[PDB]
């Protein structure tokens, strides 16, 4: 499943709702182009390949 969520800057985490609707918090990468740069920025998660991209 491909989901869109919101990331937090200080924890560099992506918050999204999983298959069941549960809030799920996962770590964005540190790499600049995939890290969270501002609270409530968009992030996406693909639950099959674990592609996590935070803005
Ligand atoms: O995110 S962490 O705080 O847990 C962390 C800190 C450091 C680390 O070396 C790593 C994680 C491992 C690591 C993870 C990733 S990731 O796969 O994307 O999550 C990437 C890197 C890495 O070392 C590569 C990397 C990227 C960047 S950046 O894209 O320009 O932000 C910078 C660095 C990298 O090694 C240098 C770096 C900076 C810093 S700093 O404190 O932010 O200056 C701490 C650590 C560093 O290795 C020290």
Numbering used by the authors: 1 to 55
The publication says:
PAF is a small (∼6.2 kDa, 55 residues) lysine-rich protein (13 × Lys, pI ≃ 9) and a potent agent against Aspergillus species and dermatophytes. The NMR structure is a twisted β-barrel composed of five antiparallel β-strands and stabilized by three disulfide bridges. Lys30, Phe31, Lys34, Lys35 and Lys38 (loop 3) belong to a conserved region of PAF that is important for antifungal activity. Despite the varying size and conformational flexibility, sclx4, sclx6 and sclx8 bound similarly the Pro29-Lys30-Phe31 motif in loop 3.
In contrast, PAF–sclx4 mixtures were crystallized readily from solutions containing PEG and sodium acetate. Sclx4, locked in the cone conformation, encapsulates the side chain of a single lysine (Lys30), as observed previously in different protein-clx4 complexes. Depending on the ligand size/conformation, the noncovalent contacts varied in their type and multiplicity. The PAF–sclx4 complex [Fig. 2(a)] was similar to cytochrome c–sclx4, involving a salt bridge and CH—π/cation—π bonds with the encapsulated lysine. Hydrogen bonds to the backbone amide NHs of Lys30, Phe31 and Asp32 were evident and the aromatic ring of Phe31 was in van der Waals contact with an sclx4 methylene bridge. Considering symmetry mates [Fig. 4(a)], sclx4 formed substantial interfaces (>150 Å2) with three proteins. Interestingly, a salt bridge was formed with the Nα of Ala1. Salt bridges also occurred with Lys2, Lys17, Lys22 and Lys35, emphasizing a substantial charge–charge component to complexation. In total, the protein–sclx4 interfaces buried ∼660 Å2 of protein. In the crystal structure, all of these residues occurred in the vicinity of sclx4.
